[model samples]
Target: QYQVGPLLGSGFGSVYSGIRVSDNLPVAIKHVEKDRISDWGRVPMEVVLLKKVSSFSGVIRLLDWFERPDSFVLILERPEPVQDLFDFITERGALQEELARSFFWQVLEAVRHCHNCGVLHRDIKDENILIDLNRGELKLIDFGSGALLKDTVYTDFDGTRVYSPPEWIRYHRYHGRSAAVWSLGILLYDMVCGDIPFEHDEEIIRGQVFFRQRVSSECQHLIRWCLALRPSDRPTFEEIQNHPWMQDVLLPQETAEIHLH
Candidate 1:
């Protein structure tokens, strides 16, 4: 037996908290109108991509999906005590360097898994990431804009405007890989700077990132490289993982005094 209750989300579609009445397993139910589905492909690619990438630890598990008379319903695993990364950042401001780095790798690896499956999570952003306060874990939330990866240029874009690569703006076409990397840059910038680098279209086209806080030069360099005006200029995943900044450790209490907030 199953029961659906509570209005959890409404922006892209309706997400409700549901449960297995017999076993008491919590689940998140997504209800999408037939007309609201994107034209990225036929028969709701959202379910297609989610099921394709279901094996990854960073992605929420999709237990099942079914077409209703007037809509589609998707059932996902519900892990509690988790907050959206957007709300988390709103409360915490910029994260400590160590924390941001840890979160970055998690998000990157999650997205990497999507790539490995030949799927692109075209709508990745802070709001779509869930941070488990209980375990300090991250999980990717939405895939409503997801599509299969492509080698050719993409003219139809559904990802956030800020996260979409600059090339998409200047040329109306961009490689999916480069576009993903640009979003990663935008995400990392937001992680360490308390806000995203560009607030207006001009700033995005200008391709300049001005750090508001005292971020390490190495991080700045990485952000700039990711947000580089030229899509060809961004680093490979390995380059990002091996960057000197990623290896940095928090200073020892003996060498550095702990500041009380």
Candidate 2:
């Protein structure tokens, strides 16, 4: 049991700032409310996925979880007050190449972790990523939108419109992995440019994303590999780890181990 207080963050799964009853330690509690109940099965599925990710050092630790007739509570680490990545970059200007690379690698590590655990975080955006300046850690949250990669083709059609990948909008069976990779490429571009690659009406945004505009050679290569219209042409998580841009800096963490099957 815990004594919860004001809200910390809210979305599909609303979270509140609270303290434990016994230890009195501060914790962020995620509550699955009824207003956002489309899939009851996903609730426990998220728990199992988070449990697998909890073993990773950089991941947001899942301290406790309890199910009730009306709701579910998930205890998580309460990180210090830091701006969300979008605001952080907006306020601070684009990060240096090295710093951007550092953050990107860490994020990829978390992505690798999720992939290994059979959870594809369909929603990966700046708002969902929590920043920890003191620890230089970036925690991936908002598993409410994630799903099993093998079973579904990831065609729910949700998440921030700007960060949405081109492939995802087209089909399910072909673009699941590529869509994720496209998002990563966009993230990398945003890290350096302080803005997403696409904005404006669908026509303009599509033109910029799919045709007119271009990315750096290294990033283009990576995104091109991930954004392939055909799943066969897209690189797997393992191939991403070995990419030239990632080869030197990213260590071989267990998070890199993935099983699509």
Candidate 3:
């Protein structure tokens, strides 16, 4: 028993703010047209994947759902003091490295966790990432474009074009982890550089990403490592997480008080 509220936003479907009548717990209700769903199963793949990923801390939970004659409604947890990263970045221009680092670390863990669960969010973009401004926390949202991990290279692509990797462009195929890292590369650059490195297909295929602003070379190397033209050349998420740029930098007071051997 939930009472619908105001319209929140829309992407794959329209999302409305709602409240559970029983206890007044706020929620997000997404309405998807029947035509949008191609396959019919015991339960939708999104629901299955969402339940599988319930163990992860960085993802929002699917509280419940319902099937209608012409559409389906998905009930999701609604976190307050939050806004999508797209709006957050647009209002703030480019984020400083430290802030992006904190946000990026959380996302890395989330993506890795999804992979660990044999699920990959093919559409990891700023718009799908919600930032809890009050807590400086990030929650990866929107699984409409996700797919289960597979041994076969993916062919049919529906993810954001800019995040598309080079191999996916040239060969029409890409592996799960490789393409995920490439998306992560685009995200990291987007964070500190203020925008996507490549907007056009040619730019992505060319793979010559220009860092316009003053960003650390170490981070640049990590980006370059992730954006390698060949899918096989890209490093694993673990390697990216262990990167020099990913390593923690001491705080000002802590650094001054400490001595490095």
Candidate 4:
């Protein structure tokens, strides 16, 4: 149903831009080598999870797929005028209170949605978040590290180490919810401070979180709560969404007044 266009890039194989043959809607196509996939167990689970999350907002939806003799092709949703959060932060360091709130809330909601669907997105870094700058919309992408949890503890993490929770560094094991909150905490710091709080694994394990520039007490409190050394100390996503900091997001004037504090 789509006409594949020129190559965009490659992960396990080449990714391409494409157009829907019927209405000319834009899309993304990924071609992954089946042989290489066999070398890595559960590599095809990404497609399975994407299919489940296809209808969820703030997630890059999977449209369809085709299995070939040598490869598998995945048709993915492609929203135009998009920029990854990495580029967004580079172009504009230390976002303002309201903008950061708007962006982060969407991300938190996306994670919550994933959890509700019984999926754990092991990777939740900024590189996996795409921002439609013009519309201020966010989409969570790249679920290669995701897993369908079935009462199993994840001892091995495939995402960036800087975003790993303290428990993971200390005990070498972590569950889904707390790890998600931990990464969100790091992401929040990066968005508002333009840098991560913990510089190394030692600092992360030591739980030394300090901000260079001033931030609101609410923001700092939420960050600390999420970044707590023990997984049990971190608040659940439900609590996070209802926290005073998130409530403060509703009052821009109040938020601005306390942002420098």
lDDT of 4 at 244: 79
Taking all chains together, each candidate's TM-score versus the true structure is 0.91, 0.79, 0.92, 0.86
In model 4, how large is the Cα lDDT of residue 107? 92
Give per-residue CA lDDT, model 4, range 161-181, as digits (tens). Answer: 898988888888898888888
- Residue by residue across 104-129, what tens digits does model 1's lDDT show? 87887888888899998887789999
Best by TM-score: 3
Candidate scoring better on lDDT of 1 and 3: 3
TM-score of 2: 0.79
Question: Which lDDT tens digits does candidate 2 get at residues 39-117?
Answer: 4455665676677677765567899988788888889877665446777788876665556656778888888888777
Query: TM-score of model 4 relative to the true fold?
Result: 0.86
Write down the worst ten-residue block by lDDT for model 2: 252-261
Model 1 is weakest, by summed lDDT over 10 consecutive residues, at 252-261
Which is the winner by lDDT between candidate 3 and candidate 4? 3
Task: Go through the candidates in order and give the clash count of each.
Answer: 0, 0, 0, 0
> What is the per-residue lDDT of model 3 for residues 203-231, given as tens digits with 9 covering 90 to 100?
99999979988998988999899999988
Order of the predicted models by lDDT, top scorer first: 3, 1, 4, 2
At residue 180, give the lDDT of candidate 2: 74
Angstrom error at residue 46, model 3: 1.4
Clash pairs for candidate 4: none
Question: Number of clashing pairs, model 4?
Answer: 0
